[PDB]
Design a protein around this ligand. Structure first.
Ligand SMILES: Nc1ncnc2c1ncn2[C@@H]1O[C@H](COP(=O)(O)OP(=O)(O)O)[C@@H](O)[C@H]1O
Ligand SMILES: Nc1ncnc2c1ncn2[C@@H]1O[C@H](COP(=O)(O)OP(=O)(O)O)[C@@H](O)[C@H]1O
Lengths: 55, 41, 35
């Protein structure tokens, strides 16, 4: 980096514009198979073993 | 006349280190200014 | 006989557009290190 000691990191330009979208498109890809009358369910398992089935 | 020798370089290198620190902060928030400036998160 | 209330599609348009605007206007991330 050089200047601007903020004790962190920074990303500017097309690096952050094309990373805010791959993070948004991944969340929408989880629930994309649970839409309409021909959609299936999902299973969620936590660390103790509590099973939740939902769509 | 050629007197007034300056034998200490500490004040020169410190005054120049204040310019680069302040100029760097002004360059950081240059983008967010005016009716077409974007936002930082 | 396939019907849906009109308030579902009207609201989903207004919520999906306002959320796209706020993400779109961001040109910088600073992430601070944890203490
Ligand atoms: N019998 C059906 N035939 C065709 N499309 C349907 C039928 N039932 C629901 N849909 C469509 O499925 C879409 C998604 O609904 P659904 O998958 O149940 O989740 P959500 O209601 O949360 O969007 C709706 O936009 C609706 O138009
Ligand atoms: N519609 C506009 N067209 C041209 N210049 C504008 C307009 N609106 C504001 N400005 C100018 O942008 C300058 C900076 O405004 P801005 O960066 O938004 O906030 P700040 O005044 O806190 O820097 C102001 O001096 C103003 O004259």
């Amino acid at each position: 980096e050089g200047p601007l000691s903020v004790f962190g990191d920074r990303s500017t330009g097309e690096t952050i514009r094309s990373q805010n979208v791959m993070a948004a498109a991944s969340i929408a890809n989880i629930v994309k198979s649970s839409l309409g009358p021909v959609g299936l369910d999902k299973m969620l398992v936590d660390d103790i073993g509590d099973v939740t089935i939902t769509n | 006349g050629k007197g007034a020798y300056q034998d200490r370089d500490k004040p020169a290198q410190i005054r120049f280190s204040n310019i680069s620190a302040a100029k760097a902060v002004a360059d950081a928030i240059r983008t967010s200014l005016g009716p077409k400036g974007m936002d930082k998160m | 006989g396939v019907f849906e209330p009109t308030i579902v599609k009207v609201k989903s348009l207004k919520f999906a557009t306002e959320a796209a605007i706020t993400i779109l206007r961001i040109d910088d991330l600073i992430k601070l290190h944890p203490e």
